[PDB]
Amino acid sequence: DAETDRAEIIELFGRYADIADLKEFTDLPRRVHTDPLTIDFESVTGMPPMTVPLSDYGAALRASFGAFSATHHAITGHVVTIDSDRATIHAHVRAEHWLPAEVAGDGPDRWLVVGFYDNEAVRTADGWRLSSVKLTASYQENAHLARA
Amino acid sequence: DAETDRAEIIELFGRYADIADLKEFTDLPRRVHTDPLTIDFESVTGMPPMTVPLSDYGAALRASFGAFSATHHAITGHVVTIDSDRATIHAHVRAEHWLPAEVAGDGPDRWLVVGFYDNEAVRTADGWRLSSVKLTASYQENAHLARA
Amino acid sequence: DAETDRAEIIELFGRYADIADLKEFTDLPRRVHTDPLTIDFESVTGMPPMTVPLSDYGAALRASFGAFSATHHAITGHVVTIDSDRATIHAHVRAEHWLPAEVAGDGPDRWLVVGFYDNEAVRTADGWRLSSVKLTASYQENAHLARA
Numbered sequence: 250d251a252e253t254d255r256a257e258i259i260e261l262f263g264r265y266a267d268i269a270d271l272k273e274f275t276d277l278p279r280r281v282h283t284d285p286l287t288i289d290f291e292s293v294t295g296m297p298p299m300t301v302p303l304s305d306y307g308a309a310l311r312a313s314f315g316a317f318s319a320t321h322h323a324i325t326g327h328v329v330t331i332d333s334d335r336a337t338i339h340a341h342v343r344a345e346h347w348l349p350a351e352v353a354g355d356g357p358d359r360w361l362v363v364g365f366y367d368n369e370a371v372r373t374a375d376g377w378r379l380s381s382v383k384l385t386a387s388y389q390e391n392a393h394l395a396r397a
Numbered sequence: 398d399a400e401t402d403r404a405e406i407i408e409l410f411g412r413y414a415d416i417a418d419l420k421e422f423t424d425l426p427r428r429v430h431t432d433p434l435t436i437d438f439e440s441v442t443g444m445p446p447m448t449v450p451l452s453d454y455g456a457a458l459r460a461s462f463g464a465f466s467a468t469h470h471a472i473t474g475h476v477v478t479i480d481s482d483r484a485t486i487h488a489h490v491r492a493e494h495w496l497p498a499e500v501a502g503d504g505p506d507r508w509l510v511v512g513f514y515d516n517e518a519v520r521t522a523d524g525w526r527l528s529s530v531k532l533t534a535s536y537q538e539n540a541h542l543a544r545a
Numbered sequence: 546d547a548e549t550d551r552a553e554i555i556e557l558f559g560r561y562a563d564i565a566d567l568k569e570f571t572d573l574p575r576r577v578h579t580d581p582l583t584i585d586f587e588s589v590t591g592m593p594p595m596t597v598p599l600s601d602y603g604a605a606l607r608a609s610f611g612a613f614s615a616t617h618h619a620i621t622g623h624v625v626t627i628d629s630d631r632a633t634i635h636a637h638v639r640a641e642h643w644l645p646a647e648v649a650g651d652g653p654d655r656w657l658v659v660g661f662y663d664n665e666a667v668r669t670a671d672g673w674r675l676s677s678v679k680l681t682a683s684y685q686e687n688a689h690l691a692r693a
Contacts, residue, residue, distance in 0.1 A: 252401060252548050256404075256548060256551055256552075260623065260624050262622060263623055263636065263637070264622075264624060266621070266622045266637055267635070270637065270661075318684065319683045319684035320683075321659040321660075321683065321684065323473075323619055323621050323639055324622060325414070325471050325472055325473055325619075325621055326411030326412075326415070326470075326471075327411055328408050328411045328412060340411065341414055341469065341471060343469060343471055345659070347684055363467065363469040364469075365419075387467045387468075387469065388466065388495055399549075400548050400552060403552055471619055473562070474559030474562045474563070474618075474619075474620060475556065476556050476559045476560060477556070487559070489559070489562055489566065489617065489619060491617060491619055511615065511641070512617075513566075513567075535566060535615045536614065
């Protein structure tokens, strides 16, 4: 019922965090996202929203997260609204990204993004999937490292 | 049923975190809290518990969170006990508060509070609301900034 | 039903975090864990998996967490699979451990572990309990303090 849908939608955010933090950009994205996927990270990158093939998104994530020794996404505070086979989710996110020493040198090594997801999900034949991801940053620390 | 109540009570903590972190002290508190509201932040401020009108609480939050460039509340680990139209919730909280550079100068800029909420909720005609908030700190970093 | 089981299993992780962070190693472990308990912290300590009496585990936790002024475990992203009276849970964890000043001196004072739990639970006559805990670290900061 509705509570099973809610619980499955919340769990998708655990799997979403696992994509990045386990660096598993091949199988897991198919279990988490629709194809194509709408993405909006403009609040952090200045790149406007786009709708992209899932394999492109995965390849892009693999390339960018390859810059980090590790990451940790702590996603909390899910506010889920369901209407049959669609849902919206607002959540908190705290995302830590550590640069290797070879890049960070004697300086800061951790890029922090805090803020919110305002995402959409759809109920597919293979279960709920996140069809749109939008990240709004409230604060960043060491954002220059995302460039460095 | 009971599981819908639990899920709605947990979601209230997402909305609670949103009050502070989106700095929305006017509408959201009515959706999250009863009027009046009992508050106990004594473990952090030394001010004893009080029961206050909700508009006072909102105005006070607006004034105090106005000192921060941003905040992030990560609330996790909800332990919810429900008895008809009342509930208790114990949870973990990690609350980050960043001071603007104009105030922090060359020193630390982030006030960290970790610890627990031990809160009460009531089922109102318009849904669950948090009727009592109690924060017990296990640790703080840079607490002097909450004064500065 | 299944959703009550899921919610109870997720709540166990709140109580698990409370063992360490409230430093309550006597009563709470009986409410959270089976006796005996399988533990695997090898990814952090190099000690291989073992199955130990619960009172030994509690005594060991009391001794080790006695080194810290405070800790905070933020457990998020639960992915729960249930099969009757057994479950597996994968989750994110961010665990902070602060050393007292008397030990940290003028140096770093916070040991950070980020990574994952990959745990098992069993439905006992007194409710769900965590029967196996496995922590896999993705990153640590100041791990030398866990020794110091």
